[PDB]
Design a protein around this ligand. Sequence first.
Ligand SMILES: COc1ccccc1OCCNC[C@H](O)COc1cccc2[nH]c3ccccc3c12
Ligand code: NA
Length: 287
Amino acid sequence: GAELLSQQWEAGMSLLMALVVLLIVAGNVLVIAAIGSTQRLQTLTNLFITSLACADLVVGLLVVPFGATLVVRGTWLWGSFLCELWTSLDVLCVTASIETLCVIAIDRYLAITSPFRYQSLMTRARAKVIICTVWAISALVSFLPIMMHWWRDEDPQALKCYQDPGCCDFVTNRAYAIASSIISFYIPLLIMIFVALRVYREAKEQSRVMLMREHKALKTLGIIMGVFTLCWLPFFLVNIVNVFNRDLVPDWLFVAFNWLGYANSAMNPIIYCRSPDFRKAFKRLLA
Ligand SMILES: COc1ccccc1OCCNC[C@H](O)COc1cccc2[nH]c3ccccc3c12
Ligand code: NA
């Protein structure tokens, strides 16, 4: 009865979760194998795309599976330490993603306003240093505050969760909710939007078939940026609203918005099918 409902729901939800995991992983392996085996896809810009695929891969392999076992079994099975590690990895991947999108926007702005300065300034070795720098900064603002417990609240319902090994709710104090949201998300979001609008203005101020092909590619990048925003902004708006008033937004919708964020990790591989070169490498690799 209660037990039959539980069996039906657990089995259906395990299946949906396996699908999501599979889509995230297969799609981002494909992006990475495509770029890694197609000389024509090995541009500097695509080094940043690979990094973005690595963040989404880590969400497919680690973040979503743990989150799935929690949603399905209705308890955390893995101990306190893995709860904190899982949370740190979650925060890391969102931070690395939006910082990397920001870099991509800046790379394109430079290329479109100073193609020659771009040429002498930007090399493989420098792109790699930029990628490492993004992951370094992202790890810094993710792991250390979570591992030093700067996020913990003193409310008794929070302390209840922190003491129960089967609770892995990321219940935070307000200061951390604000500061961490601004540092990991809002600041790079704003930078990315400001730069992406400038790139649009510059594109509008611009042989003909080659200019077309570039503009198709710029719009692809513009779409991954806009869809990332659409997928995560609702979550981070509710995160701030909750600080000021917990009743304005029902909890089920806050949770749904987190899952929409996770869903973003399956979207870029599909969006890259707008490109002939990606489409051809995908077809070939699936052989
Ligand atoms: C809504 O909770 C969940 C329910 C079921 C399964 C997984 C769930 O996710 C719990 C962890 N999700 C974290 C979110 O997936 C990512 O949240 C963040 C990413 C980057 C910086 C951040 N700064 C912050 C301050 C407060 C809350 C979140 C963040 C945060
Ligand atoms: Na706990």
